Each structure stands twice: as C-alpha cells, then as structure tokens.
Structure 1
C-alpha cells in the first residue's frame, strides 16, 4: 500500500481543541488518546492488533 499526501498552502491557521468553561463548580477536562493537529495532519494505522485507546473519564458523586 502506498499513501501519498501533498500539501501546498499559504497562511494556514489550525485550532485543534478549545474548551472554555466558566461560572461552574466542578470542571473535569480529559483530553488525550490519539489527537493529531496541524497544517498537514496524517494518522495512519493508529491501532493494530488487540490494542486499545481508552481516553475515558468517570464522575462519581454521593
């Protein structure tokens, strides 16, 4: 398999993840896993086999 990526750009601005939170009490931000950000972002074969990517969060309150 052959994968060819050609990018010819001018004045590129990229904003991957932006989270804004205010006037709360409990704030939990969980950013992770496989995040690719940029002008030429390529993600090939992220997981192979029995692998796993969780990027999980849990909230428990009593």
Structure 2
C-alpha cells in the first residue's frame, strides 16, 4: 500500500484501503417487546453495527454454541 510522487498545478497521489468497516447506520425502535427463556443453551440477539478484522485466527461474530462435551 504505497503512494509515490515525483515532480521535476495540482498533483494528487492516493492509496486507500478499507477492511472490515461499518459506517452510516441509523436505527429507530419503538414499543418493541423481547422475551428470552434459556435453559442450558446459548442465545444471541440484537447485534448491530459491528466490524472486525482478524489475522491468523478464527473470526466469529454472533456465534452461539449450546454446549461442548468431551
């Protein structure tokens, strides 16, 4: 990701990179009702405007696993 300029009216050199980006979000919630009953499991709810970048590893967003037995 390099930018190089050599001069010997306007000169512009640009490199832009976006990875894992969230922008420009508007939400309205009125009179909403939510009930969760969980017995021995996993519940994930209500996830909004989330950004993540991972290098050399697993990347998980809003992941639910009931249980692991070994």
Q: Give the TM-score category using the shorter length.
A: under 0.3
TM-score, reference length from structure 1: 0.21
Note the alpha carbon deviations across 1:6-44, whole angstroms, 9 max, x for none.
379999999522211113233999999999999999999
TM-score, reference length from structure 2: 0.21
- Range with bigger deviation, 37-46 or 11-20: 37-46
Change (3 A) 1:46 1:54: same
Of structures 1 and 2, the larger Rg is shown by 2
The aligned length equals 62
Note the alpha carbon deviations across 1:33-62, whole angstroms, 9 max, x for none.
999999999999534233434367999999
Is there any run of 5+ residues in structure 2 with no aligned partner, and where?
A: 1-8
- Range with bigger deviation, 42-51 or 19-28: 42-51
Is there any run of 5+ residues in structure 1 with no aligned partner, and where?
A: none
